[PDB]
Amino acid sequence: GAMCYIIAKRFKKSGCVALKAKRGKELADFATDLQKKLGYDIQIVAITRPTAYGEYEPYKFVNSFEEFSIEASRL
Amino acid sequence: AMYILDKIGLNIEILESLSYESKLGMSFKRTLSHFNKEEVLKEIELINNWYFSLEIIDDLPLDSRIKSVSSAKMKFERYYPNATYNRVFNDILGFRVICKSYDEVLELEKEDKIRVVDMSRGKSNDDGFRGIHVYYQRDNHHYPIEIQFNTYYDRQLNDWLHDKFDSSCGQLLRKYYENGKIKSAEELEEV
Ligand SMILES: Nc1ncnc2c1ncn2[C@@H]1O[C@H](COP(=O)(O)CP(=O)(O)OP(=O)(O)O)[C@@H](O)[C@H]1O
Ligand SMILES: C[As](C)(=O)[O-]
Ligand SMILES: [Mg+2]
Numbered sequence: 001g002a003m004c005y006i007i008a009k010r011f012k013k014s015g016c017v018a019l020k021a022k023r024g025k026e027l028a029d030f031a032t033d034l035q036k037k038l039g040y041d042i043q044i045v046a047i048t049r050p051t052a053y054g055e056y057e058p059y060k061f062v063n064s065f066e067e068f069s070i071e072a073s074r075l
Numbered sequence: 076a077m078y079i080l081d082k083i084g085l086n087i088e089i090l091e092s093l094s095y096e097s098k099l100g101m102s103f104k105r106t107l108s109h110f111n112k113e114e115v116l117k118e119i120e121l122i123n124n125w126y127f128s129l130e131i132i133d134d135l136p137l138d139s140r141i142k143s144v145s146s147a148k149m150k151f152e153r154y155y156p157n158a159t160y161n162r163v164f165n166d167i168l169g170f171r172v173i174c175k176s177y178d179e180v181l182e183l184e185k186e187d188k189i190r191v192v193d194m195s196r197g198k199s200n201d202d203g204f205r206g207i208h209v210y211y212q213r214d215n216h217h218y219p220i221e222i223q224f225n226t227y228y229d230r231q232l233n234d235w236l237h238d239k240f241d242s243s244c245g246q247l248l249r250k251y252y253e254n255g256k257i258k259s260a261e262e263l264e265e266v
């Protein structure tokens with residue numbers, strides 16, 4: 001089905017962590033929780049397509065919520 | 076009925092359905108002085124959560140971005156207390172589209188609920204950026220929804236301006252781009 005990409009990026013630091021994910025309650029609750037833990041210097045955003053958002057280049061693609069959490073916390 | 080909206084699979088009904096009603100009990104025509112930062116951030120956390128859960132967004136034939144609560148916090152701190160709420164928190168849901176011409180975008184002016192920010196010849200403080208951003212707002216208690224329009228020509232320099240950049244610096248880079256002096260990422264690193 002249709003997928004989006006959840007993105008983590010530190011303001012004023014180029015590049016992001018990206019995970020292809022399904023929009024829904026599970027993703028939304030994961031993102032809200034992760035944003036709280038990471039603090040306000042990190043942005044958790046959702047985009048449709050990486051090619052539409054050059055502001056997040058380069059994209060460090062990951063393959064799980066666990067890897068996304070770990071890599072986002074390293075920004 | 077509007078050509079540009081038909082091309083991007085949107086209409087007023089869809090925009091209404093994607094609009095979040097504030098429960099703060101305060102008109103968004105008011106300045107930030109009338110809002111409590113903690114209340115605003117809790118509400119924006121809920122809006123961000125809502126947009127992360129709406130599958131319909133991924134099915135629309137145009138790109139979009141759900142801005143973070145961290146961006147909202149920085150905006151609040153930067154614009155408090157004199158900025159107007161509807162001018163600050165107007166891009167939580169933000170669409171992005173390539174338009175064939177800026178003239179097809181200006182037809183949106185016909186809709187009373189759509190505010191057009193025409194920067195196709197620059198912003199008041201010109202910094203090289205070019206494009207037209209529009210904001211739909213269902214009423215004074217709903218969050219606006221943004222749609223960023225750019226031609227391919229303007230999008231190219233906007234991307235390069237984002238990668239590297241006084242307003243005069245971006246303004247001069249735009250002048251060099253318009254003169255044929257910047258034609259690639261390699262050519263941008265010399266000028
Ligand atoms: N000088 C510039 N160079 C490139 N892109 C620019 C630009 N000025 C504005 N833009 C684009 O236009 C969008 C809207 O600009 P503004 O509302 O003035 C700042 P902003 O959106 O708060 O920045 P942000 O993307 O860090 O949140 C920006 O997010 C960016 O994509
Ligand atoms: C249930 As989960 C892996 O989004 O935290
Ligand atoms: Mg930013």
Ligand SMILES: [Mg+2]
Nearest residue numbers: 142146147166
């Ligand atoms: Mg925002």
Ligand SMILES: [Mg+2]
Nearest residue numbers: 146149150153
């Ligand atoms: Mg800002």
